[PDB]
C-alpha cells in the first residue's frame, strides 16, 4: 500500500508480528527524473497486528490510514502518519455493524470516500451507516420489486462486482457471464435503476473460467475496461463511451512464458 502517502504504493511485506518491511519506491540514480525503483525494506514499530481483522484501512476517509481492530469483542483502530506515527489506540464511539460474513460486503454506494458495508442480495437493501468513521443505524430499504436483482458469489463462468463500467465514478453493480454484461444505475440509499446491458463482450462458454478476467479501466475515461487471459495472450476489450465495446486487442505474452492458475496479473502505477 501507499502507507506514506507518496502518491505511489510501497511494498510492505509482512509475515508475522512485526514483519512490517516497506520495500519503498525510490528514484533511480542517473537518467531522466522519471526512473524509479523499489528500494530495500525498513522495519518500524507497529501494533501486535493480529487476530484483529487486520487491515491498513483509512476508516475515516482522511486519505491517511488507520489499522483495524476487530478481534473477539475487541474493536477500534490505530492511526498511522506518513511519518510512521502509529497513534495510540482509538476506540471509535464504536458501533460497527455485526459481521455476519464478508459475503456481498458493499463499499461505494454510501458516497465517495464515505464507504461502508452492506450485506445484500435479492429483494432487499440494507443501508450503509458510515459517517466520517462513525456510523448511523444500518437501516433497511428495498427498490421497487420490478428492478432486476444483483447478487454476488456464483462461480458458474460468471462474476459480479462494484465497478464502474459507466465511468461516472460510482462503482456500479455489474454482472458478467461468458457472453454478456449488465450494469445497474446508482440510485443512492437502498435503491438501484434497472440494469443496462453493455454490448460486445463474449468468450467461448466451453472454457470461460471467470477468474481469467481483469477489471481495470484502461482508456483513462473512467469507463472500466476488460481483460481476459489466454495462456499465450491477453484479450483487451475497451469500453465505448460506457455503452458497448470495441474489437479486442490481442496481446502476445513474454516469449516462452505461459499464463496459468499460478499467475497473478494486476495493473498499478509503480
Amino acid at each position: 500500500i501507499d502507507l506514506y502517502g507518496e502518491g505511489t504504493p510501497g511494498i510492505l511485506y509482512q509475515e508475522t508480528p512485526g514483519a512490517w518491511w516497506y520495500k519503498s519506491p525510490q528514484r533511480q540514480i542517473g537518467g531522466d527524473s522519471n526512473a524509479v525503483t523499489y528500494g530495500a525494506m525498513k522495519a518500524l514499530p507497529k501494533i501486535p497486528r493480529l487476530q484483529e481483522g487486520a487491515t491498513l484501512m483509512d476508516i475515516n476517509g482522511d486519505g491517511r490510514l488507520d489499522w483495524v481492530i476487530t478481534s473477539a469483542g475487541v474493536r477500534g483502530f490505530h492511526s498511522i502518519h506518513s511519518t510512521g506515527e502509529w497513534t495510540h489506540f482509538t476506540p471509535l464511539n464504536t458501533l460497527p455493524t455485526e459481521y455476519f460474513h464478508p459475503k456481498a460486503q458493499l463499499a461505494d454506494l454510501v458516497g465517495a470516500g464515505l464507504s461502508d458495508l452492506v450485506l445484500i442480495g435479492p429483494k432487499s437493501v440494507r443501508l450503509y451507516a458510515n459517517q466520517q468513521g462513525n456510523w448511523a443505524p444500518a437501516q433497511d430499504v428495498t427498490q421497487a420489486e420490478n428492478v432486476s436483482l444483483p447478487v454476488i458469489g456464483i462461480d458458474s463462468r460468471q462474476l459480479v462486482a462494484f465497478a464502474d463500467m459507466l465511468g461516472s465514478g460510482q462503482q456500479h453493480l455489474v454482472e458478467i457471464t461468458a457472453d454478456s454484461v449488465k450494469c445497474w444505475p446508482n440510485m443512492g440509499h437502498g435503491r438501484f435503476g434497472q440494469p443496462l446491458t453493455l454490448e460486445g463482450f463474449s468468450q467461448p462458454q466451453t472454457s470461460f473460467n471467470p477468474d481469467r478476467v481483469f477489471l481495470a479501466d484502461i482508456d483513462g475515461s473512467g469507463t472500466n475496461d476488460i481483460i481476459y487471459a489466454h495462456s499465450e495472450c491477453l484479450e483487451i476489450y475497451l469500453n465505448e463511451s460506457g455503452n458497448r465495446f470495441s474489437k479486442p486487442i490481442s496481446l502476445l505474452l513474454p516469449d516462452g512464458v505461459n499464463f496459468d492458475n499460478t499467475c497473478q496479473l494486476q495493473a498499478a502505477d509503480i
Binding site: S207, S231, D260
Partner: peptide, 28 residues
C-alpha cells in the same frame, strides 16, 4: 515412474509444466 492422462476429450494445450512434491525421511 509413469504418468498419463486419461480423459481424452479434455484439452491439454493449457499445460505449462508439472511440479512434484515429496515428503521423505532420512537417517544419519
Amino acid at each position: 515412474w509413469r504418468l498419463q492422462f486419461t480423459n481424452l476429450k479434455q484439452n491439454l494445450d493449457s499445460l505449462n509444466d508439472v511440479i512434484l512434491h515429496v515428503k521423505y525421511t532420512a537417517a544419519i
